[PDB]
Amino acid sequence: EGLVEYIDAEEEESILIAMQPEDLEPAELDVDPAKRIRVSHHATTFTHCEIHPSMILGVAASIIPFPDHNQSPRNTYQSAMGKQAMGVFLTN
Amino acid sequence: DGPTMREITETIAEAKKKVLDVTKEAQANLLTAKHGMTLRESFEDNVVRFLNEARD
Amino acid sequence: TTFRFCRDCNNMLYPREDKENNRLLFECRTCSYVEEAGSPLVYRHELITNIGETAGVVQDIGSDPTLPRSDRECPKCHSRENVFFQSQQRRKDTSMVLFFVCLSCSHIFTSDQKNKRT
Amino acid sequence: LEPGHAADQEQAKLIRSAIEHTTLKSVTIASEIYYDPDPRSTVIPEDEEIIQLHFSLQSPWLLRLELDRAAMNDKDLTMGQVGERIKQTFKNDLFVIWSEDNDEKLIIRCRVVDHMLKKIENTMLENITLRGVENIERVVMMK
Amino acid sequence: VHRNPARLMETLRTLRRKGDINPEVSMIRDIREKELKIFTDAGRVYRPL
Amino acid sequence: DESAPITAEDSWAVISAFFREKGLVSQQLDSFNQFVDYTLQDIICEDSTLILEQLARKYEISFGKIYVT
Amino acid sequence: LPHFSKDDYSPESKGFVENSYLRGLTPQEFFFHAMGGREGLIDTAVKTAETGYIQR
Amino acid sequence: KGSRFISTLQVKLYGREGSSARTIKATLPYIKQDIPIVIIFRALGIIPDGEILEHICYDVNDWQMLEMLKPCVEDGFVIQDRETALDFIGRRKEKRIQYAKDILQKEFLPHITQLEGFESRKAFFLGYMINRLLLCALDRKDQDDRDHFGKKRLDLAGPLLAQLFKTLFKKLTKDIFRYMQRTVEE
RNA sequence: AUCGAGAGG
DNA sequence: CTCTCTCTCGCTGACCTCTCGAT
DNA sequence: CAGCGAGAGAGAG
Ligand SMILES: [Zn+2]
Ligand SMILES: [Zn+2]
Numbered sequence: 001e002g003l004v005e006y007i008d009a010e011e012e013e014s015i016l017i018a019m020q021p022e023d024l025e026p027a028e029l030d031v032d033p034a035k036r037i038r039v040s041h042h043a044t045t046f047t048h049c050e051i052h053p054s055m056i057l058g059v060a061a062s063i064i065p066f067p068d069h070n071q072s073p074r075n076t077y078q079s080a081m082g083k084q085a086m087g088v089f090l091t092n
Numbered sequence: 093d094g095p096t097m098r099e100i101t102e103t104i105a106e107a108k109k110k111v112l113d114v115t116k117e118a119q120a121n122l123l124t125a126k127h128g129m130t131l132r133e134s135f136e137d138n139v140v141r142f143l144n145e146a147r148d
Numbered sequence: 149t150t151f152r153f154c155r156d157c158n159n160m161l162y163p164r165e166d167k168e169n170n171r172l173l174f175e176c177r178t179c180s181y182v183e184e185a186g187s188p189l190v191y192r193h194e195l196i197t198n199i200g201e202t203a204g205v206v207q208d209i210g211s212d213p214t215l216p217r218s219d220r221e222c223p224k225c226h227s228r229e230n231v232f233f234q235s236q237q238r239r240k241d242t243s244m245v246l247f248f249v250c251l252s253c254s255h256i257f258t259s260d261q262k263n264k265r266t
Numbered sequence: 267l268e269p270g271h272a273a274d275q276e277q278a279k280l281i282r283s284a285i286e287h288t289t290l291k292s293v294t295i296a297s298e299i300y301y302d303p304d305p306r307s308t309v310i311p312e313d314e315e316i317i318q319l320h321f322s323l324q325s326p327w328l329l330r331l332e333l334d335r336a337a338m339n340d341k342d343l344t345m346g347q348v349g350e351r352i353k354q355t356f357k358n359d360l361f362v363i364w365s366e367d368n369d370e371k372l373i374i375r376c377r378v379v380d381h382m383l384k385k386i387e388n389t390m391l392e393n394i395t396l397r398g399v400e401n402i403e404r405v406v407m408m409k
Numbered sequence: 410v411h412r413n414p415a416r417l418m419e420t421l422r423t424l425r426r427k428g429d430i431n432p433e434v435s436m437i438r439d440i441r442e443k444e445l446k447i448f449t450d451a452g453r454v455y456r457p458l
Numbered sequence: 459d460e461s462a463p464i465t466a467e468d469s470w471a472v473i474s475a476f477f478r479e480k481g482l483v484s485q486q487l488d489s490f491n492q493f494v495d496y497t498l499q500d501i502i503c504e505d506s507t508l509i510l511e512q513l514a515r516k517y518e519i520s521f522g523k524i525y526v527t
Numbered sequence: 528l529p530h531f532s533k534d535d536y537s538p539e540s541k542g543f544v545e546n547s548y549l550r551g552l553t554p555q556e557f558f559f560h561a562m563g564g565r566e567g568l569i570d571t572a573v574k575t576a577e578t579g580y581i582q583r
Numbered sequence: 584k585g586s587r588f589i590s591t592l593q594v595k596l597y598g599r600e601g602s603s604a605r606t607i608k609a610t611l612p613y614i615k616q617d618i619p620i621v622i623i624f625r626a627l628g629i630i631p632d633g634e635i636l637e638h639i640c641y642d643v644n645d646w647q648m649l650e651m652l653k654p655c656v657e658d659g660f661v662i663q664d665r666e667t668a669l670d671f672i673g674r675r676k677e678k679r680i681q682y683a684k685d686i687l688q689k690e691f692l693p694h695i696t697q698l699e700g701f702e703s704r705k706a707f708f709l710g711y712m713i714n715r716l717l718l719c720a721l722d723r724k725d726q727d728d729r730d731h732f733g734k735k736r737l738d739l740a741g742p743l744l745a746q747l748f749k750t751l752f753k754k755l756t757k758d759i760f761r762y763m764q765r766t767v768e769e
Numbered sequence: 770a771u772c773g774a775g776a777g778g
Numbered sequence: 779c780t781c782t783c784t785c786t787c788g789c790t791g792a793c794c795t796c797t798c799g800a801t
Numbered sequence: 802c803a804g805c806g807a808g809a810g811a812g813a814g
Binding site: 013014015016043044045046047 | 212213214217
């Protein structure tokens with residue numbers, strides 16, 4: 001259908017990407033303090049929108065809970081430990 | 093505390109406003125020549141120090 | 149500088165001085181054609197080049213999403229839609245002077261107040 | 267600083283000026299080679315104004331160098347002093363006129379007294395050292 | 410070397426959307442460069458967007 | 459609703475579909491499958507022919523496309 | 528970053544993280560912090576190797 | 584596809600940034616000494632110096648690129664015909680000229696083509712490479728970086744098993760040929 | 770034995 | 779000439795512990 | 802990778 005496209009890094013240099021699909025819709029106040037500060041994208045045109053930010057992370061990083069709230073080196077250590085951690089590898 | 097958090101965000105915002113004003117002055121080229129360093133180097137050092145002071 | 153190659157053999161012309169009437173003419177070695185030189189300067193060398201502060205500005209360059217959009221406008225276009233880039237030339241001494249191109253004038257307007265050249 | 271010299275911002279500026287290496291390559295905006303058949307009459311109008319200034323008291327090809335005002339302002343060097351250093355290196359092989367420092371545009375013109383002129387221009391930009399300790403590229407003032 | 414490259418790139422993008430042009434093949438145009446690079450090469454990582 | 463734009467919670471479903479078709483080892487399987495289907499036959503065909511020349515004479519050996527059990 | 532517009536010298540583009548660890552890093556902030564941590568780990572390993580040789 | 588040989592072409596701009604007489608010479612893969620770019624262009628058949636500079640430089644106006652080219656143009660003014668430029672190549676006569684043409688088709692820009700009649704495209708690509716070299720020398724554009732993931736390629740299991748299989752298949756093919764050569768009895 | 774890989778601090 | 783740099787071009791070095799899998 | 806150990810390679814008296 002062409003709703004989605006595959007981009008290489010060289011093609012990525014020429015494109016402009018938005019993390020959140022809510023960035024594109026028009027934005028014509030009170031805010032909860034706990035929510036992290038987001039800089040306005042302030043960009044007219046985006047060629048593409050990232051499907052979800054969490055996809056840049058790996059499988060082990062996808063395991064890690066709230067790594068955005070965590071410091072990154074601890075995330076790396078936990079990825080290695082998670083490879084080391086015991087688990088039922090398969091049902092068979 | 094919420095009050096201290098508002099002061100925190102205000103401090104960060106003031107640092108950002110100062111950084112943007114310095115950047116505008118760089119764009120206007122109405123920036124004093126600093127001996128022994130490129131003018132871009134001076135801009136980078138000033139912005140970096142601004143952010144460091146904001147965090148501290 | 150203007151570089152001239154002779155038309156007959158398409159090889160570079162070399163400077164030559166006529167002493168009796170004291171003028172410079174370009175003579176080519178691959179073929180005997182000799183001509184009068186319009187420009188006084190044989191060779192120039194810029195230690196500091198502003199050349200390339202704007203490189204490859206096209207009409208299509210006004211459409212690319214990666215390029216930023218500014219509020220300011222040139223007096224000639226009188227249209228705000230513009231593209232501002234920092235100097236393409238990579239130098240130890242580089243000015244963070246914004247160079248803007250708007251499509252309707254197709255004229256480059258430069259943020260710096262000091263220089264209005266070109 | 268020398269003993270008994272404190273808060274000598276001025277003297278420290280002069281020391282910095284004396285120690286930093288300064289080259290003709292550093293000060294020159296642009297090197298240009300014109301061919302001017304007549305010593306009295308040049309095609310460039312600014313050079314003609316310099317010629318009419320030179321009413322006091324060879325090769326026709328000439329090298330014209332444009333040097334940056336801001337560099338001269340930062341440096342201890344003056345355009346007359348720069349031309350003097352060029353003359354000292356040339357030992358009257360070549361003759362130099364300097365546009366006045368008061369003039370808004372400053373042209374330094376050198377006529378040999380075109381391969382020789384080109385190689386001499388390169389030799390002059392790279393090899394001419396003016397008011398500077400050799401190995402020091404930069405000096406800054408601090409307390 | 411091609412003239413009017415934007416129209417050709419528009420057509421190429423429509424073909425890739427159709428799938429007539431393979432989605433893996435990468436087509437990159439830079440206007441300053443005046444350069445269009447097409448890479449059918451294997452082994453380049455791509456992300457879906 | 460088919461006209462209305464998506465949200466992030468909707469984007470997770472597209473992520474789901476992508477993961478279902480590709481799997482998490484899609485690259486390994488794709489490279490191997492392309493190697494078996496096409497690369498193997500091309501490799502066999504390149505430099506395939508063996509030619510022995512006698513002065514009197516010439517024997518040629520070529521290779522049909524490769525079949526994988 | 529591919530999300531950032533060209534020729535941006537703002538601290539958010541250059542990697543200044545306004546948010547605290549409690550509020551959470553943005554994706555761009557997280558990637559830049561990951562770059563920093565990567566340099567930290569590489570430098571740590573190199574420092575250990577160099578200092579072992581130096582001590583010997 | 585087929586045999587893959589990595590080929591490295593080196594274009595070098597001799598002389599320091601302050602030094603005079605900057606010359607561009609490119610070394611051929613099979614030739615001990617770098618030959619001037621203009622000599623290579625003459626060997627290619629693009630004989631006029633203006634044509635060579637037009638291949639190298641896409642825009643006629645800029646003086647700096649032409650000025651940098653002028654020392655090389657002087658170097659190539661000594662050899663003004665294709666036959667001599669092909670002749671002065673490598674170490675070892677007419678066989679050298681023919682081997683020079685063979686080296687030009689197989690070793691210079693091997694990816695674009697390996698056969699004759701394609702010299703103009705190769706010369707234009709070579710001039711493009713000189714143009715990029717000059718853009719970096721002029722400091723208008725900064726040097727390309729090695730650590731760019733788009734330039735990096737991540738070879739998977741399949742292609743590596745493919746090259747291993749090519750090597751093994753070549754050994755087996757050779758062995759079959761040895762068996763046939765060994766015996767006419769079968 | 771060797772080599773290789775991986776992992777721990 | 780000619781020792782005197784002086785600008786090239788070779789090479790040799792760079793904490794323990796525990797699996798395992800191949801030879 | 803650098804230095805130090807050499808050797809070409811002038812070299813500026
Ligand atoms: Zn001619
Ligand atoms: Zn305008």
